[PDB]
Amino acid sequence: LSAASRPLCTGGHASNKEKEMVTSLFCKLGVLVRHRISLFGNDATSIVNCLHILGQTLDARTVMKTGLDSVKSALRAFLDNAAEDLEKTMENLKQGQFTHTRSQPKGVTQIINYTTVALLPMLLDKHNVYSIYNTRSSRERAALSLPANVEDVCPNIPSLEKLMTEIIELAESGIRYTQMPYMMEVVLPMLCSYMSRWWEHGPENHPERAEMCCTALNSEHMNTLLKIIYNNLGIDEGFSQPIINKVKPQLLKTHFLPLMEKLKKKAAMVVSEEDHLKAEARGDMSEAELLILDEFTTLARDLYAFYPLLIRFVDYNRAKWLKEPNPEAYWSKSHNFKREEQNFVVQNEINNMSFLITDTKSKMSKAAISDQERKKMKRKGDRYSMQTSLIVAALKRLLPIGLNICAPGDQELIALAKNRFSLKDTEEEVRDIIRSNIHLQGKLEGIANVLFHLEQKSKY
């Protein structure tokens, strides 16, 4: 009994047979769902028009979930079981998923899409023998410039098949290889070139409705991952690329910074959305030798810390627009945040005085005000926790100034947290609307009152 992909090993043969059933049923769905007639074989003994199957439409949906989710711990189990057929099986599964999401399905398979995407960071043909990304390149040529391709280019032009949040979630699911690249770095760059070139050549606002979260397009963004729109660059090059030429990405990164620094609009939801889009477009995901080359990292981190501190300073009660910005972790930014927090504590004390006596009517408006305050507290709690963690280490060797600056905030929050049940029940409701949604505390590598920030502030 020789152990191999499917020579004798039944443990991996189970998942491989699930994959083979996926392929067979995907052919059986390509003969039926994309009928191109919708009346062929009409009246299958009641009314039905089927492509010689008539019984596998729902069964395929029932069994694809089990086939793709063969095991909950997919990343470890797949690597332990085999290291040969996983790439081709996942590639064919992704291609079939795209060729099924092009059509209008009733059920949504976003969870299974995320589960299959989870295999990509875990780490064959090396994308050379088999072109995994050919169908994805077609589906990406369908929207190679979203500001320029926001029209009826989408297949069959519905508002539900592709021109919705489905395509952005599919892109976020598919493009995730931060832990380990799983491609030859050929077929993705010459779509990313069009995407980034049109990002620079846009100057357009007012995007399409129901797809405001355009920021979920890319998560593995970095250099070579614009003036290279390729119309003449293909003839010029085809040997030379951004891997060898390190000049242009640095120039573009230096160009991006002053434009984003110049944005200092005050009291505008459009300013908030522009800042979020700016953070996603030119954040701190550039992992191109940041440890060795530290000047770029320092400048980028300083700007990404100076922007929101000066943005959210005044009141900015409507903090629900920010979903989950990446923090991208003694400092001047730390001192500025300490000043901002000690100024914010005064308004918090004023609100506490308002809650103490002469309470407003409309208990539902009390709940709304408490929810707004809880949202502000949730937004500020993370940065307060990182600042306290930085301060505690700073004051160890020699930094009495940090402890003296942090002392009034401790008393401010202690006075705030005396008896606030009318705020605590609303905070519980807010935290029950979405439990944590990031589970940042449990990573050890969303937030309430008595956690890491409070204990670190109290420990000193």
Partner: protein, 338 residues
């Protein structure tokens, strides 16, 4: 050790490979610098052995063929498939590539080409080292039978060679010539076009992780008279190398013999497995670097336990400063180690 026998199907490929490797070896020897010698005049840089493959005598040819057969046996006996796909171009699939380069002087100087541009397999150095080790066993057996270059009890020979110990005495610098010769041989093999796998890598489960476990475990603690009962105490433990070490509290001995944190008598915490030890396994804490202080602390008043690794408090998955809770006072607790 001795390895498996050569299957009869490979005899023709063995003969062809032996012939071409003899040709390359003799022209490399000629290129080394020595010249032809009539009879044993090495002092004049004249070597009778330095002749062409066809000009070799019967005994020398037989010895060279046997040596090539042994090396091919050793190459094929590893276990990895050596099914040749890029056959060497000599009167079979002729793609003559040796005369691409050309060097000639006074004498018989055929032109060899070594394709160093091809990627050498990562396991090829392992094959070279294994060939060296098998030949080390060969000359170890020969010296055991003979008693050459050292007189231990006979006191006939002196100047003991470091070849008795296979690897420790013989450094890489000492056998640079043999290493370079084997490297040239495997380079010629790669130029012929042999594709080799890497069984002794991460592709197959062959790595050795730990020499042993389950025993040679020791327990360190003080006298029973120091069993604290009240107050809140502090003691420090420092780690030098990562490994199976349990640090916590014990009790006066009641269980016969068992490791720390797996019975009533002992409480323990681990970072190598990142799990606390108390009547089972419960994930808790992170690992430690070389030269870290566990920083233990005792809270006897309310029956709570906790740790401070280098001033950093350790919190569990639930996010609490409590390693253990709800345990009887017993006969006190004592600092313990494994």
């Amino acid at each position: 050790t001795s390895q498996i026998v050569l299957p009869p199907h490979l005899e023709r490929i063995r003969e062809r490979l032996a012939e071409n490797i003899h040709e390359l070896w003799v022209m490399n020897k000629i290129e080394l610098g020595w010249q032809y010698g009539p009879v044993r005049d090495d002092n004049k840089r004249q070597h009778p052995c330095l002749v062409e493959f066809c000009k070799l005598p019967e005994q020398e040819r037989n010895y060279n063929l046997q040596m090539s057969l042994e090396t091919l046996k050793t190459l094929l006996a590893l276990g990895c498939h050596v099914g040749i796909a890029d056959e060497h171009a000599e009167e079979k699939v002729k793609k003559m590539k040796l005369p691409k380069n050309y060097q000639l002087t006074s004498g018989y100087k055929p032109a060899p080409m070594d394709l160093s541009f091809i990627k050498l397999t990562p396991s090829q150095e392992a094959m070279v080292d294994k060939l060296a080790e098998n030949a080390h066993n060969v000359w170890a057996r020969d010296r055991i039978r003979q008693g050459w270059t050292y007189g231990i009890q006979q006191d006939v020979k002196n100047r003991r060679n470091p070849r008795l110990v296979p690897y420790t005495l013989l450094d890489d610098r000492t056998k640079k010539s043999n290493k370079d010769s084997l490297r040239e041989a495997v380079r010629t093999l790669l130029g012929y076009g042999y594709h080799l796998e890497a069984p002794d890598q991460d592709h197959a489960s062959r790595a050795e992780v730990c020499s042993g476990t389950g025993e040679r475990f020791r327990i360190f603690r003080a006298e029973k008279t120091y069993a604290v009962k009240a107050g809140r105490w502090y003691f420090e433990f420092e780690a030098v190398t990562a490994g199976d070490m349990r640090v916590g509290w014990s009790r006066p001995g009641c269980q016969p013999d068992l490791e720390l944190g797996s019975d009533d008598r002992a409480f323990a915490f681990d970072g190598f497995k990142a799990q606390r030890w108390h009547q089972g396994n419960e994930h808790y804490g992170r690992s430690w670097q070389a030269g870290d202080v566990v920083g233990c602390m005792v809270d006897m008043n309310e029956h709570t336990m906790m740790f401070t690794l280098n001033g950093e408090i350790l919190l569990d998955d639930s996010g609490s400063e409590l390693a253990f809770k709800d345990f009887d006072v017993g006969d006190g607790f004592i600092p313990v180690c494994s």
